[PDB]
Design a protein around this ligand. Structure first.
Ligand SMILES: *[C@H](CCC(=O)O)CC[C@H](*)CCC(=O)O
Ligand SMILES: *[C@H](CCC(=O)O)CC[C@H](*)CCC(=O)O
Ligand SMILES: *[C@H](CCC(=O)O)CC[C@H](*)CCC(=O)O
Ligand SMILES: *[C@H](CCC(=O)O)CC[C@H](*)CCC(=O)O
Ligand SMILES: [Zn+2]
Ligand SMILES: [Zn+2]
Ligand SMILES: [Zn+2]
Lengths: 340, 340, 146, 340
């Protein structure tokens, strides 16, 4: 007969024994370096220049293009459930608006500045973040101003970007989040805010560690910002570029960032950990990108995972990795979930 | 007219300029701390006790239950393409085989030891790793031997586990990988190999940082190992448990691990980074789990991502985070892909 | 001891039994507040031998200071020493080096978590603990005096 | 009978044994990283513009508003008992003196500069520190010069502050201690002293880690400096702001601080510890604030604590946490106490 062999073993070493720490569900909570609270959540809004817009994108629930007359009905119950902050993206759909230097980016009649005024009026307690970039506003779809050869013009780009960011702050944004990844733009935006007497009022949340990759599909559909020719590989960081991420984090903090965003999130959790060391004195924010969000929905429909369950697992992972803030398309779900 | 405002900015600081490092595809390769090679890949095999088995699981291509008479046709072209290593999981389907102490785990007539002998005979250059646990062999589906109250019996479990691991080594496995997460099992397995005069021949690859969660669905279907009552939350680490992971890594290295596995992978990249510091002198291996693998397939079918593209992005992320080895169900694809 | 000083070995032997006995009764966690040298090792070994260590969180009062802030507690639990004081086992308030060593010790001996007590008046020891015991839960005790 | 159970235990490990270090009162002294000496104590004085003033505040013994003709009788026995240093705060009570730019702050006929000349004359061995801020001198009660919207004007404020600090030094203060918490003020004060040929004579003791909170009640009564509209939350650091404190400490040292103050003290002992690392090459000074001081008096009257006992416990805690200097309203008591 094959029988069950048992080796002779020595007494238990105390050093081996971890189990006393997580044998009960309250202890598995205790083990977290930080807990998931409502005020950590930042929800992206896509504002259309059609004020009556309410267009669903890629069949996902929490990616809609919304016009300003539709915003109050949409935000009211979200704010009702404890939503504390929004991140605005503009989607000017009117023809002839886009041009090679992104003129419409700070159009006072544009959806970002219209949305800022709407929200400061109707939801004065909401904390407003605006994305700062030109890709949603250039005819070529790139994040900066280009040389005739299609490459990025650093100085011209950061000059333009700094104005857009000051102009959003002037309009009433509490926070600017430059997502352009163009060398030295945070320095110029900070100097711009300082010269505008707005630096003491405006949080600069840099997308300091922002990676090129395959996970921005749906966003590009909703903000209609895809590059026209080529890609973002010479300004967004290469996925294998740990050393470049670390340097971009040190740079942006040195240049005035008050907080940093790591994006994408799940797929770059190790960079979050790297950021939690380099940028230990600053808030770190994870961006659960549209590709990551729709990947979870896809997996959950195919029965691979449970949506609420993997949502909590992924979002706790951000916090485990060092983030104390989260931009996520699942904010409406967590405003309900964290209640129970 | 709203016109394009440009702020006055200062000369470029050299410290701002990162772009010279990644403006060309060869440089984006250069920026990697380590490159993806074929010999880094470890492919899991599920061996059935039906020798003629070739049963597909959950419609995924690289999860099949295979019997030994079918293994040579299956491995030949894989090894042909440079496959260097396999990780064996047993799936005894014959009734009456499973019992409360996992007797069949080291059955010499069982599929793991049959597969080991087959492979040492027919593919003498393949490096063989066997998973070491009891969950595939207990009637209750838990990773260890249980107290009458259904909780894990540490001492009885590690005694059993150490025998199974020695017995696989005796059978010809080059490496044992204990996946049980039961306190102090690596010490007892190492002592067991030492007493068997096999420790100088056998790599111990601990699943030291192995997390409870929602990503093991498909595996459980293929190895038929789901717990019968309850779950693994009192031995697998809680997802938010960074401090416990760090301690489990120090412990397993102290107890004799030659290498460590972090599992799951993408969702725990920050623990990989933590491991790359604590276990800097040891090989780190990422386990791209069945849930993560099927999530990518799901996303790619729904059009959210490109399968080859997000596969490379995810697997480079492992290496970025500190891993120099990868267990992955996508090994057959990468054996072709890394050719081009 | 007959001289009124603490008997280490006899004390930790007694303490370890009490802690196992509470666990046996159904306590999920034991928190030894005695500050007697090596008691966590003996309590952990005790739980291990009782097949209870995988169920019982040991939350050591590892950095527990002698001082003026326990008045009201002593009134409620009626536990004031009869002769003398706790200065030879509770840590002296200026004893940062001893606190740091007591933290390393108790973690090494099996603590799953640590308590720093009192709290406000020892916030710097909390900070010291957050480094030494970075992989463990730290708990602050806002004492009756505070 | 329930009887006294005793478990069987192993021989004592040497690593367990700490008791040999503190079994005797001299050893409990030996265990201190530094001892409490008289010359570590700095006593605050509130000078009134009424030269005959001796007004008690909030019934506390060591908070009185004192005019210059009353200072010599008051300091003589204090200096007699070894008092080495004072920190001056001005309380101009004459109407029409306060204005929106704090003009009276450096009034040569004002109580701070009058007190400086008195003390340099009559107590030439006393080390004189003056608080540098505008809150005691502005009609609005804020620490800086304000924009029309009531927010702080950084540049105008630091310009004003730097003059006040030079002017105190010119008057004979040995040390200036800027308590304004306005961004970059130490740089401008240091540059100011340098340009005045006074930087080699003047210790800059920054209130670098100064927190907003509930513990300044009594001070505000004695120096009559409460803000008129709103509060100090946008310049004083938020109590939970560890990361901001750490950055403010690095900043102020970089900008020329010779020493730093952490305030309040007991409630921020961990920041003292953080400061003892960041600012390891500089003197750290703890400010036992009026709220902390009166809290101890309150507790001692209610019988919760013994005043002398908790005073020694709290003040040793400062030294334990890294401070080598203490500003405290209990200095007169310790000048007697440290004798016995
Ligand atoms: C960064 C640029 C994104 C891009 O399309 O390149 C700003 C917005 C990031 C969110 C992307 C997402 O949600 O997928
Ligand atoms: C670890 C235990 C897995 C489990 O089902 O709990 C050993 C095998 C891990 C691979 C899991 C997967 O591929 O999903
Ligand atoms: C530690 C011993 C206290 C003592 O009286 O020496 C266990 C209880 C601490 C709480 C004390 C309090 O709340 O004051
Ligand atoms: C800092 C500003 C104090 C304030 O009232 O905001 C300078 C004086 C601090 C001592 C405060 C105290 O003793 O309570
Ligand atoms: Zn862009
Ligand atoms: Zn198992
Ligand atoms: Zn002030």
């Amino acid at each position: 007969m094959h029988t069950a062999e048992f080796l002779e073993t020595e007494p238990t070493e105390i050093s081996s024994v971890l189990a006393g720490g997580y044998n009960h569900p309250l202890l598995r909570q205790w083990q977290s370096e930080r807990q998931l609270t409502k005020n950590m959540l930042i929800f992206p809004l896509f504002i259309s220049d059609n004020p009556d817009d309410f267009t669903e994108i890629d069949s996902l629930p929490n990616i809609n293009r919304i016009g300003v007359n539709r915003l109050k009905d949409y935000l009211k119950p979200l704010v009702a459930k404890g939503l504390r902050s929004v991140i605005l993206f503009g989607v000017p759909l009117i023809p002839g608006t886009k041009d090679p230097v992104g003129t419409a980016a700070d159009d006072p009649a544009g959806p970002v500045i219209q949305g800022i005024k709407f929200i400061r009026e109707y939801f004065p307690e909401l904390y407003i973040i605006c994305d700062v970039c030109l890709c949603e506003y250039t005819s070529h779809g790139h994040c900066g101003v280009l040389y005739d050869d299609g490459t990025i013009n650093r100085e011209r780009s950061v000059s333009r970007l700094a104005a857009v960011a000051v102009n959003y702050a002037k309009a009433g944004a509490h926070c600017v989040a430059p997502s352009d990844m163009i060398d030295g733009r945070i320095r110029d935006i900070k100097r711009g805010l300082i010269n505008a007497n707005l630096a003491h009022k405006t949080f600069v949340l840099s997308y300091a560690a922002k990676f090129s990759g395959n996970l921005y599909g749906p966003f590009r559909d909703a903000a209609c910002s895809a590059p026209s020719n080529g890609d973002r590989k010479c300004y967004q960081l290469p996925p294998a570029g740990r050393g470049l991420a670390r340097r971009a984090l040190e740079r942006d903090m040195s240049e005035g960032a008050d907080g940093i965003i790591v994006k994408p999130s799940t797929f770059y959790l190790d960079i979050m950990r790297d950021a939690s060391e380099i940028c230990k004195d600053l808030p770190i924010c994870a961006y659960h990108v549209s590709g990551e969000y729709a990947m979870l929905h896809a997996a959950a429909e195919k029965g691979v995972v449970d949506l609420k369950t993997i949502a909590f697992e992924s979002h706790q992972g951000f916090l485990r990795a060092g983030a104390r803030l989260i931009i996520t398309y699942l904010a409406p779900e967590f405003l309900d979930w964290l209640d129970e």
